[PDB]
């Protein structure tokens, strides 16, 4: 039940804090037939633009923008990339949407089958481990890193990062284009500083699908 | 100890199709290369991929896709093998990049990565295994022939996991550069390894492991 | 689960030599043949052994011996492979005749021999494994290259036992006719499988498994 | 402790035939002989095999086959015993060569081979036991009388295994040179030892154990 | 499972002497005989004891004593064997009379005595075993050669107990009429069976088991 | 702890009672060098004569006289046999003297070694089983049987017959020439009716060695 | 299960052995209406006379004759007292006949009820303790003591003295007028030297009721 | 803790009769007396027994028996009490002689007998309790009035046992010389103590406890 | 089971004095009397108290106090007993009134008060016990002789508690009318009952229990 301080790589000793900005994609055409048809809507593009504008206004030197290989995630990265010029980009399969694990409590509308929790769960857990950890000892400066992916992924990441039961990932909810801020101090401590932040979007332009 | 027949998704309709999977190690490459993009194939490397490509074309098979690691050596061998198999879908993947799958038994002196690597990479390679090695989808009508161009530790760990052998013994296998490794996955969920580290098609003077 | 390093004879002095072992399945043969002596190679069979022989000659290796099964199909492939490797000691063996090593897991419908076969043949194939697969004698100065021309179940059981994988999974492997399978046994007792069921040297139209 | 009645192949129909098995130790031989081919019978040795042969001929039995070890001393006694039993099939075997079957209990000072021998030879002698000692095939109509000309440790281990006594006690038995040992295997699977180390037919001045 | 070295009286001074024990089954006898004294040897019986006697005399051994069962068939064979070994102490015993030592495994249909017999006779035969089969007394200077003329079940149970094999398997052995069985008991407590059911000295036409 | 009614062969069903008369030998020359030197003394012969005379005076038709093969036991059987003419005799090794089992409580003067308890114990126990049991079902008449042997043997027989701890065999004591009477009813029940009886010997002629 | 060496009063230290002679009464009129009618028969008196004669012939200086207060026990003491003149006599209630404890194995003819085992058992056990023990430390000479009582009493005494299961008291049997000899060495060790001895009675004059 | 109603013989017919039991301690006596027969009553003693006797006669009861201890002081008081109750059966007993019933709690300094006494005497006094204190026999028609003339420890132990109080507390009671103690035993098995250590009938100048 | 030596106040200095306590039941009284004041002594009652009084005067003891129950029958007997003991302090008490102390074991049919009485009266009688029955105060130099004139259940419960017997057995005792009961309490805390229900001083025709 207690916090594990070696949830990755515990004590050179690390000096740097990593700020992690987990961003859900914007609105997209769900009905789209093939993956490449599932592109952002006109509203979607407006949302990513605001999200991009907000990150630019923070006055931070972002190191990289890592993103899911799904078309909706790429298209929001395309728009957010404009407001943050000359920032390294990296495509990832690990951050594609999936079914992380059986959510508790259960739900009627959404019950994927055991094979999905098996295949996707190992992938999302692998994403968590590779992207959420304390700094390398060889990192001199504090990093600010953007991760543009999907709802289940982010919510599972957040629960795992905080060492809450991962089963409760579906007790969280994230709007489209929403910024979620995790801090990872070099002693291994994690703090969630905002979740599902879309205070920067005019209320008429906030959605979850 | 016993074979698990629901190692993924056992009998919704039932699968009809067999998947042939061709796990191909990359060719020789400049290890000393400074950045990842400098770690390109050698002149010998290119010769090896050419032979591997030539061999796959000679099989008389209609390959559906070529999936490959995002590492530069894997891409460059895919570039050459792609020429002999024209008009075949290609897909880049991070999952299949080289890593340290898990603690190998018995241990070795030259190569001992630290626990964090087995943690981070192991979950990634295991995720790769699960997403690419399984029996057919029920909605697949025809038998597939699929190429996977990646790296040694990855392939050897895939093979051990596919066969349900202890994954710890992945380093008891060894694979030459440009080598074809054939797994069959019948729709009943059964796996058979049909050849491993095959480079019989390379002239002996052109066979390497680094 | 763990690797046993004294699976035979662990550190008279200490061994210096690596043994390369080349387990070769026989070529195509007339299965319908009435008596054992009728079960001879086919025209295709002879073509396969010729290629296998040609490939071994092209390796530029000084083979020490060719040990073979006493079954007619194994002898006949040894006859052809022996031509390309002139002046190499040959030795006939009963231990390496085909059999049913042990109950395979998972089971199969087409092939179910009865308990007495697993008992009689299993002890024979296990005896073959122990007598031929081990690390070098201490009195051997130079690295050996040894050919073993026998049969599918035998080889697959040898391979599983050599690698210390569950022997029950011998039928999860599959070996083509005339196929070269390479095991290395370093003098520290470590075993590595370097290729399995290699027939990259055969034109695709001439590859079979029966 | 209890007798296993399916120690091989228990109730294609059911067996009708009893197999009489005559395990014969070789005669005296030159132990000091440098190579295996030098280890030939002595003048006394030949006298012993002659008596053993004479005795088997006097039994009035139609022997089906004489199976023998491939060691020179075993062959040479088979050569002499073969004369008195004319027109009886002969078969050479590696399985029946002398070895160290398993760690004997209690231990002995004079004779302590090392673990690798018990491993390699034990599997071979056990394989010999299983392949030659079992109840009749169902397709055998008449009772067989079979001769097996081999070596002391082999026979004593066979006998202990046949009777289902602890095989560790093989060295608690002792067999003279040229000695006949009679096992019966009724078709119900029951084994009876009817004489062991019989050399009552040799004049006392011509009995040896080395 | 392991050999007990203090199965009697292990290292008072220490034993120096080996005891050779010659367990001899009686010859053929009239089973149908009404009273015990009617159960005398047949004409063949007498011929058998004569040969057995002749054989023991030909060994060139100075026998110390002849101990025998008090049953008439055992006495009558002792009478004939005593002639060829003149001036050798004789001693009658009840302990060595025939009985049912213990439940034999596996069971038999023809012969099933009831629990009271295994109780009464078993304690008697076990007492016989202990009193006659042990290592030498320390006060015995010379190696002994001792004859024990008794019955089949007795001998077979003695042999199993002497060798520390499961006594239940006494009926897995079988002994001819007039047959010599040789046990050696070295002064360190070690037992070796050197021949069992030896009747090689009888012409085949004169060998029986009842 | 409770009486076992199948201490041999329990329920044709038996009809006959067996009376068993366990008789210790008379005085003998203990110092005698070889077994054949250990013969009865002049007093010994007097004792056996009285014992014999007493058994003849009982007016019983004795079926057999079984005896130990030791010289002192034979010699007393020779004298007792005279007073009971035409009664079957049988020699036995089972009834020779020995050390039946470790006696409790222990004693200082007499401590034989483990090998004796092993070899002799199995023999005396075998004697007990073969001679002490209920009648055969095929026995029509009540038997009266004499057993001429030795002290340790008899005392061990008695303890075993009564189902008392056999360890207490040395808590009993038996005079030379002494009659000991066991009854074995056909239902398997045993009764000791006299032990170490030498009331028939003049007091000046009673010994235990 | 093992012998208890402090079955009474274990280690001045005792020097003396006590010989104890437990004697059953002679034949008596069982049918007698009142206790005083249950007197010895003409045969009874003959038996006590022989028993008395035998004890006198032992050449022992008896210290006391203790006896049961039942009329048959007194009457045999009267006759035995004649042959041992000037020997202290003592009457006792403790040694009257009773049912000591449930006998094993059971019997059909004789099954007294629980109250008897309760009342009599405590009395016979009290008799055992008061009369059967090792010598007092203050006793210089070896004693020879006579106890004239009844069958169940004696048989229970004997079983308890020897430390055998007392339940087996009915596995013993004692003739009328029979001498039973217990020895109690000063180290606390007990030996039974004869039981139910009537070798001194002509066979035609031996009874058990 | 609870009253046991079958402390002897509970409901064969059922008891109808109540037993009154009058436990009387002896009078004063010469303790210093050398032998038991010297320990006779004093002149005061005789006066006490006379009063006790006089009191029992004045009760107007038909006493059935007077049972008494065999000690001389108990007999001598019975002699005097017997005069006032003419023609009443008398019976001597060893059971009721004085002793040490069991370890008294709490302990005392002046009087500590040793374990052997509690063993020997305790079983005797307990036997006395059981034989004399119980409910009526069914065959007793009339209510009995019974006198028991004995000693202090005996009576006090009887009383504690009769009432089912801890017998260890027997020394918490105290009884004067010549004192009457009355127990009633109704035929349902119930016990009542009606007076204890009653000497109200003695002039105070004539009351003692030794 | 064991005696508690600190049943009150165990070793201000240490106690020197013994307390004699004389628990006296009231005399006969009119039970049928309507109100408590009607329940006065009978003519016989007065005769009884007179004798009890006369007896206490004859003891030659200097009584310190007479404590009594406030019930009319207890007062009236105190009135008569007070005459024979002139100038002795008197004290009335509610604690010593009659009640139901606790459930008696064994139970009775005639008398079954209900749980509330055992609750209310039990606490009162127990309080009486504690306040009046204990060892002397340390400040008391001389031995006391104290009279307590009360009722049957009270006294019997006091006695059981004083002796540390199960209080449940209070009804196993019985006390006559006018009866003296003597408890001694030595300064070490030890209690002895020296007589109970003593009415030896009353002519038999004048003894009652109601």
Numbering used by the authors:
A (entry chain C), F (entry chain C), G (entry chain C): 56 to 66, 92 to 289
B (entry chain B), C (entry chain A), D (entry chain A), E (entry chain B), H (entry chain B), I (entry chain A): 56 to 66, 91 to 289
The article reads:
PGAM5 is a mitochondrial membrane protein that functions as an atypical Ser/Thr phosphatase and is a regulator of oxidative stress response, necroptosis, and autophagy. Phosphoglycerate mutase family member 5 (PGAM5) is a mitochondrial membrane protein that belongs to the phosphoglycerate mutase (PGAM) branch of the histidine acid phosphatase superfamily, known also as two-histidine phosphatase (2H-phosphatase). Despite harboring a canonical RHGE catalytic motif, PGAM5 lacks a typical phosphotransferase and/or phosphohydrolase activity for small metabolites, and displays instead a phosphatase function specific for Ser/Thr and, potentially, histidine residues (Takeda et al., 2009, Panda et al., 2016). Overall, the catalytic domain of PGAM5 adopted a classical phosphoglycerate mutase-like fold with the canonical three-layer sandwich topology, which featured a six-stranded β sheet flanked on both sides by α helices with the first four parallel strands arranged in an alternated β/α manner.
To provide structural insights into the role of the N terminus, we next determined the structure of the longer ΔN54-PGAM5 in complex with a phosphate ion. In all three molecules in the asymmetric unit, although most parts of the N-terminal extension to the catalytic domain (amino acids 67–90) was disordered, clear electron density allowed a confident assignment of the WDPNWD motif within the N-terminal region, which packed along the surface of the catalytic core. The accommodation of the WDPNWD motif required both intra- and interdimeric contacts where the tryptophan residues of this motif were accommodated in two hydrophobic grooves, located at intermolecular interfaces created by two different PGAM5 subunits. The presence of the WDPNWD motif triggered a simultaneous occurrence of two interesting structural features that were not observed in the short ΔN90-PGAM5 structures, including the now ordered proline-rich β3-α3 loop and the newly formed interdimeric interactions resulting in a dodecameric assembly. Within the asymmetric unit, one subunit of the dimer associated with the subunit of an adjacent dimer with their α3 helices paired in a reverse manner at the dimer-dimer interface. The WDPNWD-containing N terminus was then positioned in proximity to the proline-rich β3-α3 catalytic loop, leading to an alternated arrangement that resulted in the β3-α3 catalytic loop of one molecule being sandwiched between two neighboring N termini, one from the subunit within the dimer and the other from the protomer of the adjacent dimer. This configuration promoted most likely an ordering of the loop that in turn completed the active site architecture, a feature not observed in the ΔN90-PGAM5 structure. Based on the dimer-dimer arrangement, an application of the crystallographic symmetry led to a single-layer, doughnut-like dodecameric assembly with an outer dimension of 138 × 48 Å and a radius of 65 Å for the inner hole.
